[model samples]
Target: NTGLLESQLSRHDQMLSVHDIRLADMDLRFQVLETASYNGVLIWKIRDYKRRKQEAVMGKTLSLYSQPFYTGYFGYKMCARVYLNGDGMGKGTHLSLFFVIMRGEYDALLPWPFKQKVTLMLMDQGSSRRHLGDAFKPDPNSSSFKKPTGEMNIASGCPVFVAQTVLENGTYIKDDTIFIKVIVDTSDLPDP
Candidate 1:
């Protein structure tokens, strides 16, 4: 078995107490957060305000909703509270969050959840021209070489590491849903 799996199994039983408390916390905080993030974005600022005497720990939960948009691509940046009770073991919990950027017609016949359709091109920022596509997707049997006139070389843009989600139809709704669950890995101490 992998070392990671072995380690996890060894520590599995030790996590029971914290796991139980975390679930209880999530149930209580469900009303404060919602799910999904397809059109508009949702951000949650989670906090644990309980008093901890000499190394006490606690957990919290949050949610997000996703919307559906057209048929090109789009992207967004994400930042949220991960662990709240002082980043110590059993103090702050391990967290997980997912934001779905797009959904719709393009998903109709996909064998997978949805792979990206359009390609993200990296470009030169200053002179605005660097012919890299040919080298990137070189193929002597490709039609791109036949159109090499200046078509092969276009002005390049700064390779901004932007997150993009695309929709084929370019249509989006004001309402769609995405669900996110933030889980914390607190291996438990007495709940204070």
Candidate 2:
């Protein structure tokens, strides 16, 4: 079948040249950008990306966790988790991203089964600043947004948040790191 597959193969080869140069431009920036956020935003930067990716691909680690961030002094406790090689439906093809709700010190005062819009955006570390993004609202019955009794509740979110090859061969990543921003809308809640 020299149909879609052929076209894809050709593009992939071309991408190798383009993406390869992107990798060589940096000498392994193994560090995170600890940027502060306002309102309910979390700026997450994961570094040593190439090495980390190989680890995930080879099963040394199936996923990576982002640093835990709070919405405010006493808002929902949360963090982000991602599968570099993807998980379940997206495994080996896409980058799967999930949100984790952790047990918060102020849980007793907060509402249960969190109801807020969550947005995940991958920063395009390029001159243009275009980015990849996806947003979702928690299911009223999903255990993922429920008040956590343990360190964290069940993780839930986009299994195919992004395709691995796209990131591997695009402006989505540079050197050995990338940034994904998550925002939990606290301004208001929408009707479910």
Candidate 3:
């Protein structure tokens, strides 16, 4: 009986080790932030986007958040995620782009609810003179655009940011890579 109990204890320990590994993997996914900033514009380059599309199709969330941008002493952040093939109104027609407002460490130092003009761009690498882009103002009433109370804010963005037809035509993506730009209008930030 003692030997059987020892065997059970070993099995339980193994299960716990596996659980810890899974948690560690999840932490790694969220901790890694890939970003670049130039001339007040931030860009996130998604490499091997084809694989991301596949992951999205298989019920996985493909998302990345930017490093915190400080406005005075306060911190502000953004995130971008893609839904491949699409969903809702964009299903079968477009690839979705979601812009999220993340809760920052210094959020308590800022105003209760936040408002900002955000611009999202899908660069047309095929052209240097002209690029296709879109802009939107967050609605204060909408929960998705309001101040984040949790780990991150709700994702507010266009479901039809990019049309599948345009993508397949090679007008936006080149060499399985696509660039997304997030520009935050900091003109509204209160004086520190």
Candidate 4:
């Protein structure tokens, strides 16, 4: 009388068990995010390169955003964005990287017209460690460097950050993952 019901319950519990495990994994990662780093530097590791690249190539997701990071314990707030399939003139040929300035809890205490030397690196996880790197100082006159009037300032940096071909065959990517590090120079930045 309950053969069908028995099979249904078994399958339901099997799927439920797997779903619970996945959700638990995500919860642990969220806990890590809540206690973000206070250092002036950030090393962003992006997993699922193949899947993300496929999405970008299909125009489903043109870009991806990195978590917000800081220049110091109470310094400028910033984040990084990357276009896997490229953007603007770099489309289809290069990887575009940009930096964004976000309004922070210490903005009122911080100086206006954010100015700092931002250095980005597409880390070479292979031999030689010849990481592809680029640096740029904000143009104080540009709106992108101004204090964020809304949520954030317009992103600015090297659009043609690196050629897409350079990312092939896991040279910089290992096991379908890639890494980028952003360092905001605070040597001359005024204390908040």
Q: What lDDT does each candidate get?
A: 0.28, 0.81, 0.68, 0.84
Show model 1 residue runs off by greater than 4 Å: 1-37, 47-81, 85-192
Listed in order, each prediction's TM-score against the native is: 0.19, 0.78, 0.73, 0.81
**Tens digit per residue, CA lDDT, model 4, 1-192:** 598999999999999999999999999789557745566677888899989988999999988888788877777788888999998889998888888898887888888898888888789999978788888888989899887878888988777888898777548989999998888888777555
Better of 1 and 3 by lDDT: 3
Quote the positional error of residue 5 for candidate 3 in Å: 21
Least lDDT summed over 10 consecutive residues: which range in candidate 4? 31-40
Tens digits of per-residue lDDT, candidate 3, 1-192, equal 989999999999999999999999877766543332322356767777788777766767534445544343345655665566776688668887777767767666766565777888777778662455778877878787666788777777888877878775765778888777767777776554
Ranking by lDDT: 4, 2, 3, 1
1: Cα error in model 2, Å: 84
After superposition, candidate 4 runs with Cα above 4 Å error? 1-35
| 10 residues in a row with least lDDT, candidate 2 | 27-36
lDDT per residue as tens, model 2, 1-192:
787899999999999998887776543332222443436788787888888888998999999877667666667778889888899899999998888888988888788888878998788998898888889988989888888889999888888988999888888788788998888888773221
- Where model 3 places Cα greater than 4 Å from the true spot, the runs are 1-40, 61-73
Q: Which candidate achieves the best TM-score against the true structure?
A: 4
The TM-score obtained by model 1 is: 0.19
Error of 4 at 18 (Å): 22
Best-matching candidate per lDDT:
4
What local lDDT score does residue 16 receive in model 3, on the 0 to 100 scale?
Answer: 100
Q: Please give me the total number of clashing residue pairs in predicted model 1.
A: 32
